[model samples]
Target chain A: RTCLISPSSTPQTCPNGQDICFLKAQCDKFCSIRGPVIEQGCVATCPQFRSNYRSLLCCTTDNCNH
Target chain B: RTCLISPSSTPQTCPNGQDICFLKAQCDKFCSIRGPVIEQGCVATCPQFRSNYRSLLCCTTDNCNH
Candidate 1:
């Protein structure tokens, strides 16, 4: 499994026990620029924040978020 | 990554391209037994089925679902 830790960090193999891949995209609504901030990586559980400003995608495959 | 292909199929290593591990459990709302159905495995992407009857977990590590 692969998890991208941060924007500055290259993708790293997900830690043991983190077996799910996920990607979340959120509109920078709080910012004046109104852009997209994407977060992707490995996790043990998926999350959902229902709003008009964010979207979440999940998968159980390698680098699926990529 | 690990993906549980089926109830009958033993847990298998997710395919090479499947980097994310996921588990999806749905309440059998339509069934008379009223039990939870579990679906888990690896995939290249994640999905969301918005209902009150299901749960989804995603991770990016090996055997994290366990």
Candidate 2:
């Protein structure tokens, strides 16, 4: 199990094997892309940033997002 | 200017010289993290995802978000 949520809704579960928890959050400042207002869950495969940003993260561990 | 938008909002501009457009969009499909519904603009510094997701991308170009 891992920390998770989706948009404005609750209830999330990681499906299948492989990958881990994929957390996507919103930045909480103006012209700034950091902070917390998170949306969490799991991913079958973690996508590549092709750049970078803290708002999106992938972690694998039992209930790791918590 | 590049393609851009916010959460149900419009009007965006890239800041001073540095990172280009910071586009964060929501996926349209269920249980999938790709497709459109974009939020666009610029970033002082593009953060690293430490993972991946197509919905979040950083591009450097004139109004690149467009």
Candidate 3:
């Protein structure tokens, strides 16, 4: 399954690659800005920020990751 | 109205520092990862990410920026 890559990051399967990865930040420097990393063989799951202020995702079409 | 600071960044008035700032990254290198910046005399307003994927914020309680 072909997938769309972004910001020159990486590539993955459409449904096989179920998570949309991105960076998250906060005003509180002490606040951990742990978001997501688009790596090879990444898992197919959901992701979210610590503050619960936001989240991320991937895929939206037929033959999506094709 | 003193405010709380973190990551050794900077401080401001709770309400005055309404627009909390931060950094945002993307998987596609082509995509611009623009988010926010902690600065001086910053205005009080709502801020958000460009791709509609995520967001940021500040403040919590009374005299928050104490």
Candidate 4:
């Protein structure tokens, strides 16, 4: 038994999915945005969803298995 | 189109809705103890969804009507 790959379903693909020429190069890579109070934009400047809700397993409680 | 919603539907609710006794009081009200990382837990400590996707009038794309 070596089972451990179930994000409910899995359809995860969100890495700036494409398009963002440059907001001045994303504010020079997430700077001037320091310390607590999380809430930046564009899904929180992307990159930070590593096995949180177990991939939400296709989030289905109405919608949100993402 | 005086309509401005449709998050592929709508049934989003995650305000620590269920349970979680106390992970040291949710790490004492979310503090990285230091940082620019968003990964606290229980739906990210809820309350941050104002509006962006819009899934009204029986929102849809899969399911969600809230």
Span of ten consecutive residues with least summed lDDT in model 3 chain A: A55-64
- Tens digits of lDDT, candidate 2, A1-66: 334454443435564775466655554566355533556677676665444333454443323322
DockQ of each: 0.03, 0.06, 0.05, 0.03
Model 4 lDDT per residue over A1-59, tens place: 11112555533333254311110111233545652122211222322222221111111
Give the Å error, residue A57, model 4: 15
- Which is the winner by DockQ between candidate 1 and candidate 2? 2
**Winning model by TM-score:** 1
Residue A6 of model 3, lDDT score: 56
Local distance difference test, each candidate: 0.50, 0.49, 0.34, 0.22
Scoring only the A-chain of each prediction against the true A-chain gives TM-scores of 0.50, 0.43, 0.23, 0.16
Ordered list by DockQ, greatest first = 2, 3, 1, 4
Give the docking tier of candidate 1: incorrect
Interface RMSDs of the predictions, in order, are 10.9, 8.2, 9.6, 11.4
Ten-residue region with minimum lDDT total, candidate 1 chain B: B57-66
Chain A of candidate 2 gets a TM-score of: 0.43
Error at B27, model 4, angstroms: 6.6
lDDT ranking from best to worst? 1, 2, 3, 4
Model 2, residue A51: what's the lDDT?
41
Flag regions of model 1 displaced more than 4 Å.
A1-66, B1-13, B28-30, B49-51, B61-66
Off by over 4 Å in 3: A1-19, A22-66, B1-19, B24-66
The sequence of per-residue lDDT tens digits that candidate 3 reaches over residues A1-66 is 434455444455445543332322223343457433223223444342332333222223212231
